[PDB]
Amino acid sequence: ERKYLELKSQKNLYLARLKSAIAAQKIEEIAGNLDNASASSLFERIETKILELEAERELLNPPPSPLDKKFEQWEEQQAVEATLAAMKARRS
Amino acid sequence: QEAPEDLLERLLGEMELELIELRRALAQTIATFKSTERQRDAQQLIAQRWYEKAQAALDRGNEQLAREALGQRQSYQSHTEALGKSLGEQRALVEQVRGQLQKLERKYLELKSQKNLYLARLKSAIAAQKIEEIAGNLDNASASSLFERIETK
Amino acid sequence: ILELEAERELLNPPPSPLDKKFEQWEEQQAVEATLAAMKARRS
Amino acid sequence: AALDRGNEQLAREALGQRQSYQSHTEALGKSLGEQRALVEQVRGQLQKL
Numbered sequence: 001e002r003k004y005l006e007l008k009s010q011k012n013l014y015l016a017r018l019k020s021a022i023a024a025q026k027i028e029e030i031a032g033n034l035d036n037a038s039a040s041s042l043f044e045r046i047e048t049k050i051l052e053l054e055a056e057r058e059l060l061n062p063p064p065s066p067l068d069k070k071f072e073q074w075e076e077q078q079a080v081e082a083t084l085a086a087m088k089a090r091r092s
Numbered sequence: 093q094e095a096p097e098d099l100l101e102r103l104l105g106e107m108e109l110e111l112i113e114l115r116r117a118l119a120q121t122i123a124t125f126k127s128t129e130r131q132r133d134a135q136q137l138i139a140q141r142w143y144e145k146a147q148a149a150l151d152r153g154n155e156q157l158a159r160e161a162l163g164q165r166q167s168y169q170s171h172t173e174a175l176g177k178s179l180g181e182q183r184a185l186v187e188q189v190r191g192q193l194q195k196l197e198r199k200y201l202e203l204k205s206q207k208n209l210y211l212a213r214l215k216s217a218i219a220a221q222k223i224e225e226i227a228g229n230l231d232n233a234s235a236s237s238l239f240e241r242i243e244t245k
Numbered sequence: 246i247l248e249l250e251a252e253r254e255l256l257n258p259p260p261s262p263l264d265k266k267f268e269q270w271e272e273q274q275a276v277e278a279t280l281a282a283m284k285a286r287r288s
Numbered sequence: 289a290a291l292d293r294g295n296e297q298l299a300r301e302a303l304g305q306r307q308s309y310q311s312h313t314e315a316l317g318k319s320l321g322e323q324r325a326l327v328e329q330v331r332g333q334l335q336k337l
């Protein structure tokens with residue numbers, strides 16, 4: 001009788017310790033550590049899936065050249081300079 | 093396999109259920125520990141009562157009954173020591189289990205604080221990619237863009 | 246009963262005894278200051 | 289008036305008794321300080337609607 005009571009007084013603690021360890025392990029496989037980049041952590045798999053689509057839609061419709069960006073920026077600067085100069089000069 | 097985003101939410105819900113299950117199991121563990129502590133206290137109380145009875149029995153001057161009572165209380169003292177030994181380790185173990193649960197809680201909260209941002213970024217990107225296949229570019233003329241197919245038709 | 250009493254304690258941690266000591270000392274400081282000034286005001 | 293007999297024990301008891309009421313008063317004063325600030329914003333929303 002006493003032996004059985006003693007064993008029943010420990011089954012619960014052992015179950016709790018097993019469950020805590022299982023949950024602790026199951027935490028890792030989702031995120032783990034930020035610097036993993038292991039493609040096993042579910043966040044990196046989402047990140048690669050994002051970048052794949054972002055590049056795939058870029059291939060179909062090419063982005064404008066940096067030369068075009070420089071040209072349009074300079075055109076905007078020339079425009080605003082002309083407006084400000086004539087705008088100061090009109091009230092004068 | 094399946095799309096990662098749906099299994100992300102499914103796994104997070106399952107993890108929530110497992111966490112509350114762990115909380116309940118730890119509650120039962122601390123309950124049983126308290127019960128064992130109470131039983132140890134009761135046993136030592138009974139041993140003290142037997143010692144007190146022997147104290148009054150010795151007043152007669154017949155030491156034989158005192159010897160009988162003192163030999164009787166030895167088993168109870170041994171049982172009290174046996175339970176005191178086990179408590180000395182169960183108390184040190186439950187604290188570490190509680191610490192593990194406390195850390196897991198914060199980790200889960202942190203992951204749930206980012207699932208939404210990741211889903212929003214995924215939806216924005218897929219919509220941005222889908223915007224193209226209808227029209228794309230005015231000079232695209234790929235016959236895949238739905239406007240050029242209508243124009244040729 | 247004990248299971249529920251511990252389970253609701255896990256969800257909302259009780260304060261550490263250090264906080265209890267601190268608040269007890271704060272109460273003692275308050276009562277001593279009040280009684281000292283309270284004696285000294287009529288004097 | 290309790291300290292008037294010259295025995296400070298009753299004064300100590302009364303001062304220890306009033307501490308709970310002071311704490312409760314402060315607890316309610318903390319909550320009023322935010323409820324008053326929130327009801328005004330709700331009223332403004334209603335007025336604009």
Ligand SMILES: Nc1ncnc2c1ncn2[C@@H]1O[C@H](COP(=O)(O)OP(=O)(O)O)[C@@H](O)[C@H]1O
Nearest residue numbers: 029031032033034035036037038039040041044
């Ligand atoms: N301390 C650490 N810092 C950064 N990354 C780590 C660290 N420890 C492990 N990793 C990551 O773990 C990954 C290896 O896991 P992986 O090879 O994907 O698992 P499997 O072998 O099951 O495919 C590496 O990409 C590495 O970035």
Ligand SMILES: Nc1ncnc2c1ncn2[C@@H]1O[C@H](COP(=O)(O)OP(=O)(O)O)[C@@H](O)[C@H]1O
Nearest residue numbers: 059060061062229230231232233234235236237
């Ligand atoms: N910068 C651009 N200016 C004009 N048209 C472009 C540009 N980039 C891509 N295209 C268009 O993309 C089209 C090619 O797509 P297409 O070969 O029909 O797709 P798929 O390979 O799926 O059949 C070409 O007709 C071309 O006009």
